[PDB]
Every structure is written in structure tokens, then in C-alpha cells.
Amino acid sequence: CCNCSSKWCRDHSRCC
Amino acid sequence: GRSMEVTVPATLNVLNGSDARLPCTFNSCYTVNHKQFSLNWTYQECNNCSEEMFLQFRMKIINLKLERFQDRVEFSGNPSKYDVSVMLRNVQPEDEGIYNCYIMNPPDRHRGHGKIHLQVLM
Amino acid sequence: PIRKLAIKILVHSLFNMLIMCTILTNCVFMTMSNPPDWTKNVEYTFTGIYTFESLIKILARGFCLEDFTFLRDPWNWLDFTVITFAYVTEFVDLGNVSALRTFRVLRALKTISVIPGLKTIVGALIQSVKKLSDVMILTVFCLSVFALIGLQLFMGNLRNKCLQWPPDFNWDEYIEDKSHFYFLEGQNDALLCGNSSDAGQCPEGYICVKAGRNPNYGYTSFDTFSWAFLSLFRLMTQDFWENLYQLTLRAAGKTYMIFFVLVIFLGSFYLINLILAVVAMAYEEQNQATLEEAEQDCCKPWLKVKHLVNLVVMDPFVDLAITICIVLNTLFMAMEHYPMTEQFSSVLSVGNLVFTGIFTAEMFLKIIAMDPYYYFQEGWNIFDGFIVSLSLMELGLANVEGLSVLRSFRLLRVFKLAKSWPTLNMLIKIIGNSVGALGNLTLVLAIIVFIFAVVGMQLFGKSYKECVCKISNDCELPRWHMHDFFHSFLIVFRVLCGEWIETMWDCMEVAGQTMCLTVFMMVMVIGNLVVLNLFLALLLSSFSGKLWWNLRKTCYKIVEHNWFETFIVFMILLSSGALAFEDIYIEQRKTIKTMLEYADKVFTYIFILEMLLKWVAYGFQVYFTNAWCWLDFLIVDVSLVSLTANALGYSELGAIKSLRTLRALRPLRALSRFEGMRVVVNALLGAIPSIMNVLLVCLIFWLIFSIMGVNLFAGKFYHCINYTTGEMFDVSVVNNYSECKALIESNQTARWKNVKVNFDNVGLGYLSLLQVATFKGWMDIMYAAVDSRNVELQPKYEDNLYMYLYFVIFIIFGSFFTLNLFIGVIIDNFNQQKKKFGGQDIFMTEEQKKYYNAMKKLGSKKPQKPIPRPANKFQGMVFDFVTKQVFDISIMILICLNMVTMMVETDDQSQEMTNILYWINLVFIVLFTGECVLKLISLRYYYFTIGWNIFDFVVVILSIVGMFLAELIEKYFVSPTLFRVIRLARIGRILRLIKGAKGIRTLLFALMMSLPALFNIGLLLFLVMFIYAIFGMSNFAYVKREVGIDDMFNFETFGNSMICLFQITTSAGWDGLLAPILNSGPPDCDPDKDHPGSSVKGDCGNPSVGIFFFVSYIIISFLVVVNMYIAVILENFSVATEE
Ligand SMILES: *[C@@H]1O[C@H](CO)[C@@H](O[C@@H]2O[C@H](CO)[C@@H](O[C@@H]3O[C@H](CO)[C@@H](O)[C@H](O)[C@@H]3O)[C@H](O)[C@H]2NC(C)=O)[C@H](O)[C@H]1NC(C)=O
Ligand SMILES: COCC(CCO[C@H]1CC[C@@]2(C)C(=CC[C@H]3[C@@H]4C[C@@H]5O[C@]6(CC[C@@H](C)CO6)[C@@H](C)[C@@H]5[C@@]4(C)CC[C@@H]32)C1)COC
Ligand SMILES: *[C@@H]1O[C@H](CO)[C@@H](O[C@@H]2O[C@H](CO)[C@@H](O)[C@H](O)[C@H]2NC(C)=O)[C@H](O)[C@H]1NC(C)=O
Ligand SMILES: *[C@@H]1O[C@H](CO)[C@@H](O[C@@H]2O[C@H](CO)[C@@H](O)[C@H](O)[C@H]2NC(C)=O)[C@H](O)[C@H]1NC(C)=O
Ligand SMILES: *[C@@H]1O[C@H](CO)[C@@H](O)[C@H](O)[C@H]1NC(C)=O
Ligand code: NA
């Protein structure tokens, strides 16, 4: 995954 | 974009003794990375017959030099330009059959498949 | 037969109905992403009906070799286009690829042709764009002049990356790895740094070098004028601009905020004023010309049992006993929360049957004595019986899942209060006006949003799926995409809420820059124009002794003096300026700290001694009736208590240590000292009863959405995370709270975590809806609602997908109609407060009007014949030719050739490109010097009567200084950062193109008329910024560096606090500063962080004073900025009136 503390991993990942 | 579009002639009719270019282009939206791009060309005598791989791209072109085919076969494409065509020189009647192109262009998810029915004319 | 025969069909309304439902049938079929095999013969029927409709229309008009028929109407061209396209895909071998399936939406534009009344409205919006032509020249001029300033100042500065010097192909090959750079907490965007001090620092062992791509996708830069034009249009629409603000100051330095404060003020404020003032002026003369144009024993005992019923509820307060059973029913439903125990839910569940029973009995007892069916005649009783029906449908099944949203549908009885409460009735009249008299205008807004959602889903919908891995983490679709109709409606709805930039990065990455620039800019030009006209049409239709007395005189002469008032105002500003020095660093200084401690006594003993002079010079009766003396009385009492507790011995206590934070109220003494702040406060507090009667409606109207939100949500935002990485567990791994507590007891790293702005309460529901109404924070809340599965269950991705329609309906009702009722009441109170004074132009003082009434006379006049000459010499025939229009227009064309040669500059251009651009900027400087030195030879005596010649002389000199002193820069004491700034002088030549443009000069003059009234309000807003910067600096300097608080943008010092309060004043990213302050205790923060060398321990926040900090600053800055919009847009009505 990636770190959910970034605005991009929010919008563009499912892990968050 | 459920699958990645492969353009080939469904039927290719070639005179015995002429050169047969088997055309095969694809549009995949990502750039072709030669370190990850994958191409396999196979032959099968019939839809329910065994496939024989005869050429592969893995880092570079690998020609398997199949005995029955020969050394006649050549790559005739340019992967970076989305062209994976092959050339069969001096086509013989036994070359009649089905030619399959299988394409993977990571990180594009979908695998491509083109199928050509090569017929050899008198 | 013949013509007579094939003509009748054309006229019947029955022929106009089957075409009107054929289009609506096909608009449903445009929604489907992949067309099935069976839908193809239905697509042939639609081509057959549209052929037949154009067969009756070719056979009605003219026959027997007679030209054409309907080849004059613009809408039959669209019918000819859609017929000739629908058959051209049926021409044996024509296409194959067919990229233009997006021409199938042109038959959805046929709704305008067939629905009666939509040709008038679409024809009335094109007419209003023709009025905007002169504003749109000034906006593109100002977004070009400001785009050349950032292109000179910030040239590639956004490519500074912080590279490590190697711990264990030199240069190109080493600076192109993307692993040698430093990424902060997985941001995938490569921290920016500066060599400047007050810029961003790099951590130890790294250096800053300009090498890399750019931020966000490569799309954010000031290197290649096209990209600088994109980012100042993004600052003009204020769209995530605070990331562009903080990126640039991290790599340029924190002193270039003067660019950002000037461009938010000149660009985001003035251009949005001038666009919205000229649209509202255009609409005002459209409905004016329209109004003007219009000017130019069964029965027996049934009655026996009835009479009784009738003889009821017509005189006692039993119709008033129902409105107290409704405002009790609202309050029982507002007490629902999570988690509530049994014996409290039993009061909630027995209680709901009680009000439902006496609302079902009350309409049964009303349909006895009111003669049905003349009961279904009033409308409210229809509305009453409809709520009672669905309340018994909700009680009748109790099986709906998940369709229990209907237990929030008994919250709708609150609108019965609009009979007596007359401001809730104004809310219903506006919402009913959109469906009623303005119903065809909201229907056009329905179609254009529908067409924009079908277009982008046909163009870009296939490219998102086939290009997932460019814009997403695990090669899947993103939260915001266009692969189906519902998600492509949500993008188009987003753009209309102001967020058009983030989605455009993901389109341009996936479908190319040219085709996503053209589509998304058209959505936000056409769509924001239709929303703005529907906003104004709803607005303008709705409010359409021998020593004892001899000491009294001596004290009176002191306080009335001119040297004593100037002393106290000097002491007020130093007492407040001493508050700015109390940083984190004030413990380490040890020399300014003791100067602060002596000054905290001297300032207090002055404002005690001047207070007792005001007691003796006035008496208790005069002094205690001045409200400004009450403000100065209360500020001394805070000073007296903490002094007499630091003298008695009560040094440290929970109250006395917290009264010291109330020294931020000390700047409020400046309000009664300045006439600029006093006039604006008197005009805001005079309008305060009108706001409270509207704020009461807004709290009742948002109460319905907030009790609805607790029913949908409240318990369903809890989730387990792996806290070593902070990512939400899968539904395959953790299904519920029982599976997660199984991990924690098995010693894993899991936490059942909540979202901390959620819908557990009604009170936390008000805080959730204010992040959604402002569009800051609403991504986090909606990602939790759409994943909300059930109470005690793990959230699954987009399981409850259609909960976006909750947030869409709240933005329509509780943000578009709520704001529409608020603006209409302030403007209506503005016209009565301007009338009660006699009266004229509030927010200007008495001196500031006489500077205004003569500046009005100056800008509307012109002189006649200043023309002596150089009399009779060779200079006279020179003066003949130079005064000609040939010399006049040739300088304006050759400034346009100078504007183009500044646009060709690019970061990292070649050395031969730099020389050619130097030798051409040499030969422009010698040309414009020769143009102004020739005026001095052939017009000797004055040259300085009018302003444009005085402006032309100074611009020439500063350009020469930028060339002449530049040779001293390569000779002597050097600084490149002053070379970037003095080179900005040649953008002054561009301003000389305004000399001829009459109509931009009308926009610029009524702009400059409002600078007196906007100065007075900007002082009352600088005072509120200054007070809130002192509260935040003392409270929030030690708050943990989470989302919006970092090493660069925080509340540590006074310089840091004022760039954060300027950011919140636009409301930009106030959710990100609030998020680390809602932390209270561990596991989140650490109450013992011991940051030396100070006595203060801990990095936690106070959630109670932080919610009061941010929410109260949002409300106060909203009222004072919306008076800035009213003061300016009403100046634009005052120059168009007299002209
Ligand atoms: C910030 O300041 C530092 C130090 O003053 C600047 O660092 C210097 O940057 C240059 C390239 O920008 C480094 O590379 C050197 O240039 C040649 C060019 O062919 C390259 O091949 C070599 O690798 C050579 O190192 C130079 O080492 C470096 N100097 C130091 C002392 O670190 C930096 O450019 C400044 N950045 C900005 C944006 O102003
Ligand atoms: C009836 O006769 C009265 C007449 C003038 C009345 O015409 C009005 C037409 C609407 C208009 C242009 C008027 C004043 C405030 C304007 C608003 C300021 C607000 O600012 C914003 C922007 C910032 C946001 C915080 C929300 O508010 C806009 C949405 C709001 C706004 C731009 C919506 C449009 C309003 C004038 C006087 O004639 C001399
Ligand atoms: C939490 O979820 C688990 C798994 O869904 C529930 O346990 C049961 O697990 C078996 C197989 O793992 C399933 O076939 C059952 O259907 C599950 N029961 C239910 C009711 O879903 C567990 O019961 C859940 N916890 C609670 C308190 O209901
Ligand atoms: C939580 O996240 C970590 C990071 O992916 C998971 O992986 C462990 O990471 C640590 C530190 O890098 C290693 O020491 C472990 O060896 C990793 N685990 C395994 C199985 O190799 C970790 O498993 C996650 N834990 C939970 C409960 O989800
Ligand atoms: C959890 O950790 C504690 C540490 O004190 C240990 O005693 C216990 O046995 C552990 N239990 C499991 C299930 O890992
Ligand atoms: Na945005």
C-alpha cells in the first residue's frame, strides 16, 4: 500500500 | 479498456514461395519497456491442436528456430512502436495453420491475443 | 391531400409528445456504459422516429421543386446533423474506429427544441455572455500580467529537490534516480527546499539542487508561460491554491507571500467581484425589459355524529398543542447518539410511538369535521396526511434494510412551523420558486449537467480503465473516475462546487492535455454561468465645591486634549505590539523577556491611571452609558485580577494561569480609537437582528440534515488499522470488531479507530456538515459514509455507494438555498440601513466621503485643447508628425510585440536563445527611450500635464536602471534575488495598453472608488487576524506536526501565525489545521514530550478550544468578507446608473 496520511493515497488507493 | 486491442488479419492468404508478413499491432496506453515487455508467437495446426512457441521477446528477440518451420522465420516489428509483426520467408504449404501473438505490456493489466489463419495458395 | 394531407400531423401536441418522450427514453440509454446486444434494435427505433419526424417536416413546408423547408431555423440544423450522423454508421463500409460516438449526445440537445420554453432561456443566456466581453478582456489581461510576474520570480523554483551527497554517469545519471531524493512520509512528491533562509530546509546530509520533474504530475510550474497561466487561473478560482501557496514558499522563501497576498486580492477578489457584478447587472435589465414589455338513518345520523367533530379544534389551543408536540418530537429525535444504553433507547422507542399515535389520531379527527374530499384542498393537510402515511408504512414493516431512511422522514413535520415563523416560510418560497416560476431554468441546469456527464463518460470513460496504472496505487479505478455514469455525474457536480483542478490532473494523465483542457474548462465556464444565473433569479424574485469641582475641570482638560489622545493611542499600539514577541524563543532570549515583564506593569498602570481620570472628568453617570467605555472597563478587570493574584500569592492556579491567555483581547481597545474601525462595527452590529433570525432558520434547517445523518451513520465510521503503517484492514482479514479484538489480544498492531469528525452526535454532526458546506474536509467524511457498512462491522470499499446522494442533496438544499436566503436578507437590510441614515454609502467616514465626492467628479470629466506647440521651427513639423495617429498606434502595436517576447522565456533555455532575447530587449529599450526622449525635444515646455506621460517616463528609467546597474552587478556587490525583482519593471510597459481601452477603464475606476470603503473593513479584518494570531500562538505552538501543521506553516511564532490566518480567511484548508488540534490524549499524542528548553510539556491539543477557535473564526470572517463583496458590487451599480 502507501501511507494514508497523504492526500493522494486517499483519493487513489483502496487501502485507505 | 477491459482488454488491450490487438489488430491482425483474421485470414492471411499467401502464395507458396512468397514471403508472408504476419502483421500484428497493439495499442496499450503505457510505453513499451523492453525490460518488462513480453511477446510470444505460437503456431497450432487447428483450434483444438497443440501450440508450438516459435519466437519470444524477453529483453530481446529469441527465435526458437523450430525444426519444421526453419530458419526462415524473422521478427518484423518494432515493440516501441507497438508493432510485433513476424515474417515467414519463402512460405511452404506446411506453414498453413494458426499463428497466435500474445502480448503483455506491464503495468497494463490486460494480456493481448491476436490470431491469424494463414492459408497457402498454389 | 398532398400539402394539406402531410401538414396536420405537424401541429398537434400529440405529435410533440411522442418525440419528447423518445428523447427522454434515449437519454436513459446514454447512461448505460456498455450497450447490450438486445438494445441495438431499440437504437434502430430511435433512428426511425427521428427520420419520420423530419419526414413530416420536409413534407409540410414547400413542395414541387421549391427550395427547402426548415433550412432557416438553427435547430433543424441539429436535426439534420443527427439524422446524417445516425445513418452514416449504416453505410456498408464507412468507419470501424468511430471515436465520435460523442456526437450521439447532440440528440440530447433536442430537448431544447421540443420542450416548450427552453429556447427562450438558452437564448437569454447567450445574450448575457455578450455583456461579459469587456470583463473577460480585463481578466485575461490581469491573468497575463500576473503570469509574467511569477514567470520572472519563480522560474523552475518548483524543481528544487533535496538530494543526498553520496554515502557509499556522473551528474545526469546520478541526479536522475528518484531514490536519491528525500520523500516525506510517503507523499510521492519529493520535498522542496531553498538555499535562501526563510525558505525550506533540508535534513542533515542533503543539499538542494534543481533537478526533477515538477509537483503533482509535472503540471505545476512557472517555467513556460502556458504553465504559469494555468496556476494563476487556479489562484483566481481559489481551487486547492493553498498547496500551490505552500509549495512555492518552501522553495522560494517565506517572504514571497507578498506575491500571494497581492494576487488573491487583485485576482481572486476583484475579478470575482467584477464578473458577478456584470452578470447581475445584465440579468437586472433583462427582467426589467420583460416587465416593461408586459406593461406595454345513514345521512341523518352520519351528520348527527359529525356535528360533534366539527364543534372542535376551532377555538382552544389544540392547534397550538400540536406545534408544541412537534418541537418536542424534534428534540427527542435529536437526543439519539452512539453509543446509548438500553433504558435510554427505550425512551427513544416508546416515545416515537406516542407522537406518531397523536399525529395519526389528529388527522383522523380532522377528516371527520372538515368534509373530505374538501380536506385535500388546503395543501398542508395533504402534506400532513402524507407524513402520517409513511410513518405507518415505517411502523407497518420494520423490515426495510437498508430502507429505514424513512424513520428520518418524520423529521419533515418541522415545516409546519412556517405558518407562524415567517422566515422559515421565506425558505420554502425560495425552494418552491426553483420548481415553479423559475422551473424551466433549473431544467436547463439539469440538462447541461446531464450532457456534460454523458460526454466525458463517452470520451474519457474507456481511457480511465485502460490507463489505470498511471493514476492509482494498485492498478484499479480511483475514488473519482468516469467509467460509468454515476461517477461521471459526481465529477461534474464537483467542478460546480469549485474543485476542478485535482480531477483534471487525472484526466490529462490518461487522455492527453488538449482534450481534457477543452472539456473541463467548458464545464466550469458554462456550468458556473448557469448556476450563477439560477442563483440570481432566485434572489431577485424573492425580495422583489471650591476645590472639588475645581479639580473636575482640570481632569476634563486633560482627557479632552490633543496630546493626551495621541499618547493613549500610542500606548495602545505598543501594548498590542508587545504581544507579538511571545514566541517559543522568548525563554531563550533572556533580554527581551525581562523587557516584556517590566512592560506588563507599565502598560497596566497607565490604563488604570487614565481610567480614573475618565471617572473624575465624566462621573459615573456619563462614563457608564458609553458602550466603548464599557469595553475599556472590562479589559482593565482582566488586568486587575491577574495582577492582584500575582501580588497576593496566587501565582499558579487553573484560572489565573488561564486568564493570562486573555491578553489577546487587549487589541480591542483600538476599535473606539479609529473612525475606520468604528463605522464598520456600527454597520455590522446594526444588522445583527436580521442575521439572528436567519441563523435561527439555518440551525433548524441543518438540524434536519444532522438528525438524518445520525440515523444513517453514528457507529459506522469505526475501523481497525495496522498502526505501524496506518492502513485500513481488509474485510477478508478483519470483518468486524470481534475479529479485531481477537488480534489485539493476540498481540498484533490493531486499533478500533474513529474518524474524529463524524456523525455520532447531533453536535458532531453540525461540525461534519460545515466541512461539507464549505468544501474543506468533505472528502474524508464522504469516504467514510460510502464505506459505512453497519454498526460494529468493518467498512468495505464503496459498499454503501449511493450515500453520495445524501451529500448532494445537502449541498443543494443546505448550501445553495441556505446561502440564497442569507444573502437576500443582508441586501434587504442593507437597503434599509442606507435609508434610515437619510442617507448614503455606509463603511465610509466623514473625512473619507469628501475625498470620495471630489474623486467622483475627477474621473468623470476631460480637458479640452492643451496644445500650445513648439512654435515655428524644424521642431514644428516634427510636432506635426509625432502627434499623428500613425505614431500613436505604432507604439501600441510595438508594445504587443514586447508582450510576446517576454512570453517565450523558459526555464533552462539555450545560451543562444538568451543572447537573441537580450539583443531584442536591448533594441526595445533603445526604442522606448528614443520614443520618450523625442517627446522631450518636440514638446519642450511641460510633458507632465496628463498622467500617462508621467507614467511613461518612470517606466523607461527603471528599465534603464535594470540594464545600467546590471553591469554594476557583474562588476560589484551582487545579489541575484534583487536582479529578479528590478527586471520586473518592464511589465509596466504592458500597462500602457489600458490607455485606449474605454470600458476596462470604467471597470478600473469603480474599482478604485471602493478603496476607501474597503480600507475601513480591511482594518477591522486585520484586527481580528491579529487577535486570533495571538490566541493561536499561545495555545497551538506545541501541537503535534500532523496534517496541516509542519516545520514551516504553524503557530510557533507571529510570522507563522499570520500566514495561517490569512489562509483560513479564504477558508482554504482550515480542516487541515484543525485535525492535529482535535487530538487529546494517547495513543495519538504525547503529554510529556519535554521539548527543551522550556517548562512546557506535551504535544497534545485541546479539542474544546480548537473547535471554538476555528469555527468562530470561520463565522466572523464570513460576515466581514461578505460585506466586502456588498460594498464593491454596489459601487458597480453606481457608475452604470449615472452613465
Ligand atoms: C544551492 O546551493 C548549493 C551550494 O552552494 C548548490 O550546489 C552546487 O550545485 C551544483 C549543480 O547545481 C553541483 O554540481 C557540480 O556541477 C557539475 C556540472 O557539470 C556537476 O557535474 C558536479 O556534480 C558538480 O558537483 C555542486 O556540487 C554543488 N555545490 C556544492 C558545494 O554542493 C546548488 O546548486 C544550489 N541550488 C539552488 C537551487 O540554488
Ligand atoms: C433590489 O435592489 C437592490 C440593488 C442591488 C441588488 O442586486 C444584487 C444582485 C445580487 C448581488 C450581485 C448583489 C449584492 C451581493 C452579491 C453577493 C455577495 C456574495 O459574496 C459571495 C462570495 C463570497 C462567499 C463567502 C459567498 O458570498 C457570493 C456568493 C455573493 C454574491 C456575489 C451573490 C450576488 C449578489 C446585488 C441596489 O440597487 C442600487
Ligand atoms: C464477526 O464476523 C465473524 C465472521 O464474519 C462472525 O463469525 C461467524 O463466522 C462464520 C465463519 O467464520 C460465518 O459462517 C458466520 O456466518 C459468522 N457469523 C455471523 C453472525 O456472521 C462473527 O459472528 C461476527 N461477530 C459478531 C458479534 O456477530
Ligand atoms: C502491519 O504492517 C507491517 C508492515 O507491512 C506488517 O509486516 C511486518 O513488518 C515488520 C516490520 O517491517 C516485520 O518485522 C514483520 O516481519 C512483517 N510481518 C511479516 C509477517 O513478515 C505486519 O505484518 C502488519 N501487521 C498486521 C497485524 O497487519
Ligand atoms: C501477549 O503479550 C503478553 C505480554 O505480557 C503475553 O504475556 C501474552 O502471552 C501474549 N498473548 C498472546 C496471545 O500473544
Ligand atoms: Na481540488
Side-chain angles (χ1 to χ4, degrees), chain C residues 362-379:
Chain C
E362 194 272 334
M363 60 87 71
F364 283 160
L365 268 65
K366 188 179 285 185
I367 64 172
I368 293 171
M370 198 262 179
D371 195 6
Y373 285 165
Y374 290 153
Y375 180 79
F376 293 158
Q377 179 66 255
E378 184 69 28

Side-chain angles (χ1 to χ4, degrees), chain C residues 457-716:
Chain C
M457 175 251 179
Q458 292 298 321
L459 289 175
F460 311 111
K462 191 176 266 75
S463 295
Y464 283 31
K465 180 64 73 175
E466 75 183 6
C467 298
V468 283
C469 300
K470 290 180 182 292
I471 57 156
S472 84
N473 169 84
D474 186 77
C475 291
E476 225 134 42
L477 270 147
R479 236 76 177 35
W480 295 88
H481 62 274
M482 287 184 177
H483 185 70
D484 56 347
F485 177 71
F486 182 67
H487 285 88
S488 61
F489 170 72
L490 292 177
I491 282 181
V492 172
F493 183 78
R494 218 188 167 196
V495 173
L496 302 187
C497 295
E499 298 197 70
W500 61 264
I501 205 59
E502 290 229 71
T503 42
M504 194 183 74
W505 290 340
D506 294 291
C507 186
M508 289 161 69
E509 193 69 26
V510 90
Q513 301 177 0
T514 177
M515 193 171 68
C516 292
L517 261 293
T518 305
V519 170
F520 286 9
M521 294 299 176
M522 182 176 287
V523 173
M524 66 173 292
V525 167
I526 305 302
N528 284 114
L529 187 275
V530 179
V531 172
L532 205 285
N533 287 316
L534 191 273
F535 186 80
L536 296 172
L538 286 171
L539 191 61
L540 277 73
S541 68
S542 297
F543 65 103
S544 68
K546 277 79 67 178
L547 60 91
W548 180 261
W549 183 258
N550 211 165
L551 188 145
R552 298 289 303 271
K553 180 67 177 67
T554 61
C555 294
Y556 182 83
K557 187 183 288 186
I558 293 171
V559 302
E560 292 289 332
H561 206 190
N562 206 163
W563 283 265
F564 185 76
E565 183 180 1
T566 315
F567 178 73
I568 298 298
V569 179
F570 182 70
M571 283 293 107
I572 287 170
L573 293 176
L574 296 181
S575 176
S576 302
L579 297 172
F581 291 162
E582 295 176 354
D583 300 332
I584 303 175
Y585 298 100
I586 197 61
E587 290 294 332
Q588 284 75 244
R589 291 190 178 102
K590 293 295 183 182
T591 180
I592 307 171
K593 182 182 185 295
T594 61
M595 292 178 67
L596 262 288
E597 193 271 330
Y598 285 166
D600 201 7
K601 305 300 290 294
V602 177
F603 292 158
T604 304
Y605 291 156
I606 286 178
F607 292 118
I608 290 169
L609 194 278
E610 67 93 21
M611 170 183 168
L612 272 67
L613 289 176
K614 293 171 76 70
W615 280 354
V616 177
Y618 293 155
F620 290 160
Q621 183 63 38
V622 179
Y623 184 80
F624 284 153
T625 56
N626 295 117
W628 295 109
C629 291
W630 283 97
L631 182 62
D632 293 331
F633 177 74
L634 296 174
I635 297 170
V636 176
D637 289 333
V638 178
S639 297
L640 285 171
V641 169
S642 65
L643 190 149
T644 194
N646 208 164
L648 193 284
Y650 292 164
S651 176
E652 295 179 352
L653 196 145
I656 304 300
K657 298 294 287 184
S658 65
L659 291 175
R660 186 174 180 267
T661 59
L662 297 173
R663 293 182 297 171
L665 283 306
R666 287 166 62 183
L668 291 176
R669 296 178 186 271
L671 283 171
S672 65
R673 299 295 184 183
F674 294 105
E675 297 183 355
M677 296 179 182
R678 194 186 303 115
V679 170
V680 178
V681 167
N682 286 320
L684 266 72
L685 271 69
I688 209 66
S690 302
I691 299 175
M692 292 295 107
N693 200 4
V694 172
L695 179 59
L696 259 292
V697 176
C698 299
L699 289 177
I700 295 300
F701 192 69
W702 289 14
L703 187 64
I704 293 170
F705 283 107
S706 182
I707 302 169
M708 187 183 295
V710 179
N711 292 319
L712 296 172
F713 304 133
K716 300 176 187 178

Side-chain angles (χ1 to χ4, degrees), chain C residues 122-142:
Chain C
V122 175
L125 267 61
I126 305 303
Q127 186 61 252
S128 180
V129 172
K130 189 176 180 180
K131 277 77 178 175
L132 287 176
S133 67
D134 204 353
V135 180
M136 296 300 167
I137 295 170
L138 177 58
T139 62
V140 75
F141 181 78
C142 293

